[PDB]
Amino acid sequence: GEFQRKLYKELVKNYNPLERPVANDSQPLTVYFSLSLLQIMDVDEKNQVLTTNIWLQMSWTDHYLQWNVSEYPGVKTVRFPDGQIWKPDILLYNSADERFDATFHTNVLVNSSGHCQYLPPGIFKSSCYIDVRWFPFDVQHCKLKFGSWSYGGWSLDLQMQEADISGYIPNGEWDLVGIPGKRSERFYECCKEPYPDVTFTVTMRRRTLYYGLNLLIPCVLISALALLVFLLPADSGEKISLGITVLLSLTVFMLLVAEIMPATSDSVPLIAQYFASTMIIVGLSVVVTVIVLQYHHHDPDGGKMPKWTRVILLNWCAWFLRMKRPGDPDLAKILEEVRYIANRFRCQDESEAVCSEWKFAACVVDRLCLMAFSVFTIICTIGILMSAPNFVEAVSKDFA
Amino acid sequence: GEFQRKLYKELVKNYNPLERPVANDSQPLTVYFSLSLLQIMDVDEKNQVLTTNIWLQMSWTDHYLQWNVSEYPGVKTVRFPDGQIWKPDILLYNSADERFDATFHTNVLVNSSGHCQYLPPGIFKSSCYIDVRWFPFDVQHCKLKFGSWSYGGWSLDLQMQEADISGYIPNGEWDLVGIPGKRSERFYECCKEPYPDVTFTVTMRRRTLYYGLNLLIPCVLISALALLVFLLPADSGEKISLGITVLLSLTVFMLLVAEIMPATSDSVPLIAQYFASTMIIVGLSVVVTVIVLQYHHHDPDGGKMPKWTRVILLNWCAWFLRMKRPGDPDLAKILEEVRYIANRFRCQDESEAVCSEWKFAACVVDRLCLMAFSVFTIICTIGILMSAPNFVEAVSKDFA
Amino acid sequence: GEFQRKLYKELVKNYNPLERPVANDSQPLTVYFSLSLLQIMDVDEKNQVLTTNIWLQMSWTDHYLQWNVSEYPGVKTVRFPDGQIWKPDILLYNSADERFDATFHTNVLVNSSGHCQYLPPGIFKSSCYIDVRWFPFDVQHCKLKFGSWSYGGWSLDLQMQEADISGYIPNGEWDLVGIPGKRSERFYECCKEPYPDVTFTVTMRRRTLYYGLNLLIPCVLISALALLVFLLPADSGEKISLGITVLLSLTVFMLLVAEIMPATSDSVPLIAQYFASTMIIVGLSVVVTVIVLQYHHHDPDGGKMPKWTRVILLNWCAWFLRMKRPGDPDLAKILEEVRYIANRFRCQDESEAVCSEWKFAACVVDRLCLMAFSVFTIICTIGILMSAPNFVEAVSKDFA
Amino acid sequence: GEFQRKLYKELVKNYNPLERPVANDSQPLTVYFSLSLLQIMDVDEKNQVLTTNIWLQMSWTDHYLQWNVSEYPGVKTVRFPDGQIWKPDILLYNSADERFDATFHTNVLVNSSGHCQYLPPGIFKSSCYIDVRWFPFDVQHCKLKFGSWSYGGWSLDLQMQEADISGYIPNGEWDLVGIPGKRSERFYECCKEPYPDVTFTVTMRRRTLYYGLNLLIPCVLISALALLVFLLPADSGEKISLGITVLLSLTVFMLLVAEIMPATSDSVPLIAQYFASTMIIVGLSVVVTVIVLQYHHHDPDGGKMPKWTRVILLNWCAWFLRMKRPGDPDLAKILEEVRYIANRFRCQDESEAVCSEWKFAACVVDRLCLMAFSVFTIICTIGILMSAPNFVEAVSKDFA
Amino acid sequence: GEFQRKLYKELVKNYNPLERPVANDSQPLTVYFSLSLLQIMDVDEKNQVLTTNIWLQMSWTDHYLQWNVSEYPGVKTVRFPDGQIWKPDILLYNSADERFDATFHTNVLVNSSGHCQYLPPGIFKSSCYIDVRWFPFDVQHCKLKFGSWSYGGWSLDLQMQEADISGYIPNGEWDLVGIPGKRSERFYECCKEPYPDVTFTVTMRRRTLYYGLNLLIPCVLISALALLVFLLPADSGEKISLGITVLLSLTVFMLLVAEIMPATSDSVPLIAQYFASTMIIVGLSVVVTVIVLQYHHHDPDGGKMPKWTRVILLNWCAWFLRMKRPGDPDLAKILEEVRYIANRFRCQDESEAVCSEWKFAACVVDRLCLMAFSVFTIICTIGILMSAPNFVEAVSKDFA
């Protein structure tokens, strides 16, 4: 329209986009800053990068862009693109993007009274410290620090407004707890003027159903399978294979967890502690299996069972476990031959008796170590899992 | 031509690309918006990003860009590149590309009566929620939401036209069910003016032949092969190897499947339910194999067969399964010697009979558990597969 | 020089880059379009993207860029950068790139009579249908479609010229079969005017030496290795281990091949069919081995061989391949004792005879299944490999 | 305000950004250059790239940009964007990104006296040689070289100021040892005019807790487990399986480590040396157990143990290792038969005596090789670990 | 300063950056071109892309950019940014970057007499054919082709200058043999004017220490370990397991090398030939093991040893190997019973003698095949390794 054309012609005249829109140059310009969070795009623990979708909200007052609505009775607001009016140079300090500024430059809407609104959208990547001490049950706080780059406290006075989460789209992995904000002015070695900034803290809680069903459960099942080796009779040689194959499966689980986790040395993580506990458990199980096999294939002639070992294993542990221990001259020539044969049979009988004793001792040791290892693994797993804070809260909210 | 040059020089006189081309400023401006879908390039499940090829379609009317055809013979249309004339700032809301705008800026075609068309092409990356509850038999709905950014309800009037699928190029993996659209109007915390938008909901179906053949059939086959452990005789010690090796193959299969799936806690997917059930089935088979081996290698004098176990196994299940149960002083000195030898032989025969009885009991248990495990695995697999909706539709459309 | 400066100053006065350079405004402008292929950079089958290196040859005539060489003796041609003169806007329709147009803008060379040449180079990424029905003996046709985005048939007259492959650099994996092209006119739902376009079809053939030597040969070797299970005597205990390890190796081979194929559902790839056939063959071999092991560790008194089974195996099949068959009162008391001993020995002899006959039956089954499985493997492999078209051509051209 | 607008209009009059702002045109312009490190984003050893967060600091004096505060009350500083005033083209020489310049251009702040400050932020990717000789106990020095690209010391004088680490954010992987800088001058064969440049040498240490816990401890554990072959009795046939499976685990660990290391031939990494040592140890263990199995299964009638071997093993080693060493007409034919039976039993007896001798020899060999391997592995591991410089301080810092 | 400002104002008067700065238009313009290589950043064999860091060097003479130093006492040289003066359009013909130009546009330094220098830095990605026939003992030549795009030989005269490698930084993996260059002019389908270009051929050698230590030696070691299957006694049934597991390790090695290696079909790589040979050797070892086990478990009454087999094995090969071959009515009734027992014992004796003969034959075959396979693997490995050219030079440079 003619009124719109005349207004655009008049406003642009004698306008310098390099000048701060203030009637009085000695007074700070008040700028209100906020943001609206739309989506938590990604959390990268290995690279420690948070990717989010955010609309920034900037509001201020321009002294020159004012007109009387009566003279232009059809237009109430105007729009100006980048590079033709003054705009705050607000940037995100802790950016992790190859381009430091990742905001799409849109139009700026102006009142008839000179009120400027700026709503740039963006996919922001920031670098926030990620704590993996209590993973999977960790809670993360990520910082987003915004501030002007070349405007101190005597020129541009930054003000904070509460973040808007009405349009937030729930994520399938993280639960949004809150997004508080705080405004603070700091000092820099460059300059002698304080510089304000606004920091928004995003608090997120990781949902644990996927991890607790894909990592925790198979670990306990496979550890139980390793415990099962204490039930196989020693007469079938399939114990070492069981133990070693279980160890291999644990190693592949460890490589998966290692490829999904950051290489930080800040603290030992809970999953690593669990894997180490299972490592020692299965290794000691294999060692005990070797000891049992050594006892089982004991040569009867090789030696005699120590008195202490006998008095322990065959009586105390047997009673405790309620296991019962199993148990003319030609005529003279024929006579001595059959005597020799009978004596040979007697010797074989004594040898088999000693062998049976050794086998019983091996069985007793096997049963004792089965019970002990079951108790140990149950206690260790329960303690390690429950040591995490808010573990019960996570379990309730996810599974229940 | 001279007429074209004269018209181009005349049209841009006193023009201003910053103003809305309306004869009356109070009245709004009508803009018709639509799109043409060319190809669905990629659907990402881990990152939940949809990549598509789309030609936008914007049409409107410009008041100033009008001329008489008679005064300028030959010329009927003109083309204006970016920055010469006014354009709507139509943006995709739920974008996911590093640059918030993915459209490629082309010319704008204008008729002799002031009618502007704008059809820019683009590779659009959007963020839509992906449901993996019924994977791989799932149907996905991905929403693309376009709208003006800085133009309100009384300035720009958005009208929806039907989408174009005439130029669609079919995708091997995905089947395009449809693409309806809806024009809505929303309020925002920024402002007191309604803002319209147009949302197109691409509804797509996943073709299941590839995933079926390369995921489910080998799983079924090797799960059935794991049942061969009940056909091997216990005399050959090659049962634990069977069980633990098929378990390892299953574990690597689960790892491969997990490496393609999102880490969401919304629900437990069908493929995960299948794999978990088969894991427990194989583990129970291994435990039963251990028990059977324990029965097979029972010590002849290590105990007595319980009456309950005998009456349960030897005569009940064997009858049910139709199993046949298998089966002169020198002279006096030689006399007592041969008596000793014969007595030892008789004792050995009795021990052999007891061992044979125990072995038959083990075989009976093995056969019983074979039948039970086969029934259970077939029932579980059929139930889990049939529980999904439109599974019969997917089968009839893909395999047949 | 002075003439160059004068001509450059004169050629720009009253020149509009927005104006189509034709003497008569109602006549179309003839533009000649052609390709120049330099290298085939990549063929991504998983993402179905073709990356190539091409130069675009565009030629046309400009009315206003004409001069007489007798006035500027030194200069014969001129050069104009982007944005200074009118240029055609030919774009590639099927572009699978973030930016829809990947061409490096270079200078436009102009005659002394107004002939403009434009030769922009570029690495082009396009989306074309890649079919893996005949992998790895497939021939691929990929289309590149070029056309003016906003100029109709009445305005811009597109003409086709034969593509140039003189500077083509041969690729180590794909063999260039050809690259013809064709013009076409199409209508669009936008408008009521035909839009010409030029489509160039690149036809390429894959060289199969690497894929054959790295996939086909090792799988056949492992199949032959798995066929050895029927040569191992049943007295050893490694049959199942051999079979299952072969199965594991081919499972990882299947994973390696599967990570490179697109997830398409159009057909079943040849390599997928061949892998499935090998899987079934090895599984049946394992089942047969289990049957034989059950058939060899048979209890002597646990049953009797059926007459049908005996007349099938012991005589018929054995003769088929010429297998030989493996074949005072004290005196009275000691008398009965030695009779008992001898009778025990006789019963043992009868039992071992029955066991030996059972073992011979097992050996016969092993031999028969060896022959059958070898025949099946040979027939299936030969048929599957020979089913592919141009397989003889590929072998003759890649194994010479 | 009016004063700000008037000053902005006045300053840019007759201003040329191409001109270097010096009052004499024959004396160099002094530029103070400094750096402010914020965070070490990444250290990619495979590609040898260091990614950091940097705040450049450039200060100089502009002769033309001066005014009087009294004539422009309230205005004390001004801001100038790109292309408005002169800037020094200071670049990083060893950049390793697509576009050579990775800085983000911001405003330039000018005081009333003409002092200009410039603090552009950036995420800088640089190429520094990374030493992996003592990985993981390594210390890395990476150099950042900054200098003007076109101006020289006769026109631009560079000066060095100490780097700022006030805002440094600790990394969970690297410890910042320091960042010393140095200003250097380079001369040319043409002219006696110095050319200055600045170099910052970021030296940092790697925290070894994660790498040690995830690599060394599991490998030592499994290497010690590989020694269990010498405790298994030869009757249980699992020694070879145990050893070869530990070899498989070794290969898995070797590939996992190799995927992270660069393919450098400068030296042999410490981790590679240690893995090779463990390879050799386990391989020799396999050879030894093969020898032991060969001795244990010796044919009693297939040979005689030589006197040298007898005195070496049976006597000397057993004494050293305290291994106890185990251990009417009819009557004529009746005599013949019983004598034959007795002699057959005696022959069997001497045979099993020889077999027992061989088995004892195998046991002694096994025990002595167990002791030798046990001491050797400990010595080799301790030596390799201790050979690394600063190992003691590294472990103290990372664990205590 | 005033003189610098005046000179800058005067030089750009009437200057047209679209014209060649030549006094005579007929004569060509001489441009000197060279480059300085700083670092070889990457050599991607799979994609066949060379990424390097270079500085271009262009020198020419400008006719209009001349002035008298006496009039401007302080000014000696000037600087002009992009778009202000004429520059050559030199491009890299075989670029592989997504943007065809990778140079960073810097300032152009201008003499006091018109000489112009231009040194833009760049990270260049180029596509060069990489031959891996002799991998890893390979020497690679990669060509960088530079030339003007729109200027022919009659206008722009390209001249070569020797490249500078003074600032080259050695690479850990690649040894720089050298970079010579050649200038040549060609004809194109454009037009009938020759176009010159400069091609620099970078020749480099790969350092083989890393690959030899990490890929070759482990293959040799485990291949030698696979030969231990010929020393294991047949009683310990763990030969097939050993062979199949070394097979599995070999397959994973082949998987890794397939991962690193490009999929070309020009020739069979040396490492591929080596791995194929090792596959064949271990497979034949497994076949021989199967034959040996078949001979070992021979039914004594199932057949008779052939006279041939006897004369080749039992004595001929034993001589060849110095192998020693191992080693009243009651009275009548009692008599016949005991003689029956004795005859039974005689039968067992002759059966065990036959079995011992078969076992000795198996041992002889085992030793023969051990020696043959050792010779085969040694000669094959030595020949394959030594077949490569410059293998001795590579070994002497990378190990001594």
Ligand SMILES: *[C@@H]1O[C@H](CO)[C@@H](O[C@@H]2O[C@H](CO)[C@@H](O)[C@H](O)[C@H]2NC(C)=O)[C@H](O)[C@H]1NC(C)=O
């Ligand atoms: C404008 O800013 C600059 C900042 O460098 C001032 O220069 C410095 O002022 C302080 C206080 O006197 C001292 O460090 C030195 O006098 C100056 N440093 C250098 C390197 O010159 C300058 O004084 C300010 N001018 C006005 C009018 O405020």
Ligand SMILES: CN1CCC[C@H]1c1cccnc1
């Ligand atoms: C040698 N140049 C580069 C390739 C073609 C040729 C050329 C000729 C004219 C205009 N553009 C390019």
